[PDB]
Amino acid sequence: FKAKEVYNSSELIITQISENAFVHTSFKQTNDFGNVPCNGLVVKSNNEALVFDTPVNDKTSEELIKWINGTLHSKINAVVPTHFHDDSMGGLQAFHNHHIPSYAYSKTIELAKENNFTVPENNFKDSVVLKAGHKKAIAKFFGEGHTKDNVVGYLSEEHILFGGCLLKELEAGKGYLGDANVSAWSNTVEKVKKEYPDVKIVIPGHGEYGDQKLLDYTINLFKT
Template sequence: MKVAIKILLITLFTVSILNCRAQQKDAFKAKVVYKSDNLIVTQISENAFEHTSFLQTQDFGNVPCNGLIVRNSQEAIVFDTPTNDKISEELIKWIKQSLHCRINAIIPTHFHHDCLGGLKAFDDQGIPSYAYVKTIELAKENNFITPKNSFPDSLILKVGHETVIAKFFGEGHTRDNIVGYFPGENVLFGGCLIKELNAGKGFLGDANVAAWSGTVEKVKDHYPDVKIIVPGHGEYGNKALLDYTINLFRVK
């Protein structure tokens, strides 16, 4: 009997330690790891970093614009460029010098300037660029700088020993908006398809408002294990951002 109790206590103690370690791993505390007048980089998980630059607009003022960096084994992939080439150069330098990573790819998530405004800086350093085929079409139509490589509806790229996924689920903010997913840490870059909590509808000049909710519902169904979601503008969060966006654009 005493042996059985002893075994039970050891088992409970071991389970408790494992649970504590798991909670510590899940409870990553985000921190700003780089900040200048033009660029902020925030580490949001062990291997995912939000980069934020700013775009001066007529209708919405000086708007913070988010992108995402994921890394593994001294390799990195970036979703969305900073808003201009100078800030992109700053970001590239930081990734190389501080993360000690080679950048495998830059992936703009739609054709607007807050996603590819700094693309030339990546081109100049020989970093491959990839975009959904419609993004390339729309960039060309608007005489914007154009990513070099296209994909039909989804793309999987290696980053170290992990992968990232870029995928088109449907129209919303634009006809070409995609999302990026990092399965290794369940991080979703929603771009401008996804709104921060309590945000308004924002710029709708190229939007398909009627399709928006349905597109985000597809994203939600496809990535049930997502833990961290980074929107194109504003504060990152969890699955609540998906629900908020779905309700914001739900056709009444």
């Protein structure tokens, strides 16, 4: 499947990557890395949708929600911020304003509270299986890396791994390490690689998606 841009408002870009899945990209202004693109994932089936990661703020989250409802004609069954930083969770309040349930790893909820961020509603201690139509997606904690709380999402039918910020794009630098566990990062991603051996598409938290090579690249980037 050839990636196709299907929406571009400059603040929000949506790229179709399978018959049923889309990457949403929003932008966070930074001091150390300029204007940073930030990825999430939308899966649709039977006029229902799952969303991994909020766009970076409420405004673009409202924009994404309006597009899923109004153009994909789909209700959003759940949103999963894959870690507590704003480029996965910064627009969580917009989702709660639409009464969309949020699911997150226990540590994401702990760190949201510690930082006085919007708090995901439904705690999972290891993994949770979420449904859109007949499709099942797994959100799962494999270990620490980019943060102590980072989780991935996996769509088994389409073999799509949303790696979140635990996964780097090919040739990426190490990025922001303030909250990272660099002693665990490679081991964590090695466990991801072994659990999803049929993976066809890997989406990083920032930059260009790819295939299984992004796991290998990330594993080696952080080998100590």
